[PDB]
Design a protein around this ligand. Structure first.
Ligand SMILES: Cc1cc(Cn2nc(C)ccc2=O)on1
Length: 185
């Protein structure tokens, strides 16, 4: 891919974060805390899962950003509708307004319903996410493997403004404390 030149500066939106998350001062890193982070509840916060949105909203154009996933056992990445459900239980699917991939239990899968197996030869330490709003495309690239394609969602029904989406995952094992980090352009 040659998508890096639609690079956008993504920052995290504190107000949308699950109350156990810790967002860095520069709003470029997020990790799971070992407790509630002493914030008030609000209607934006994801209640059930360790999720947070980017501050940026997109309704047109081409956008590209990169995320560091080094040393993590579990995470979800992609984009979602601004109008996604925040409270209670839900699945990550295009029907629910999410275009995502994840790592879980040593397998990589795309967030279709049902989920789709990914074939990645080089486990990624950094993921590139490309959105073409007009084309209806969300694509994922393996930065560790020369930018190789991971997965493409096409004919997407965005149905409104889009936000960058992140899930740092639980840390029941003690092996998933590492942060997600937005990488420099
Ligand atoms: C049972 C249980 C409790 C937690 C800790 N916790 N985590 C989040 C992300 C949201 C609510 C919350 O209670 O994780 N599993």
């Amino acid at each position: 891919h040659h998508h890096h030149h639609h690079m956008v500066h993504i920052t995290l939106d504190r107000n949308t974060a699950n109350s156990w998350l810790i967002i860095s001062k520069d709003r470029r890193q997020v990790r799971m805390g070992d407790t509630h982070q002493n914030v008030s509840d609000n209607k934006e916060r994801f209640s059930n899962y360790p999720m947070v949105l980017g501050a940026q909203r997109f309704s047109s154009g081409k956008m590209y950003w990169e995320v560091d996933v080094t040393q993590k056992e579990a995470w979800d990445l992609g984009v979602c509708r601004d109008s996604v459900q925040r409270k209670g239980q839900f699945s990550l699917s295009p029907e629910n307004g999410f275009w995502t991939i994840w790592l879980w239990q040593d397998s990589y899968e795309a967030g279709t319903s049902p989920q789709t197996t990914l074939h990645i030869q080089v486990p990624p330490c950094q993921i590139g996410i490309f959105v073409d709003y007009e084309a209806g495309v969300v694509s994922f690239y393996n930065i560790t493997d020369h930018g190789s394609l991971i997965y493409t969602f096409s004919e997407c029904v965005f149905a409104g403004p889009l936000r960058p989406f992140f899930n740092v995952g639980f840390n029941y094992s003690g092996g998933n404390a590492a942060p997600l980090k937005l990488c420099p352009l």
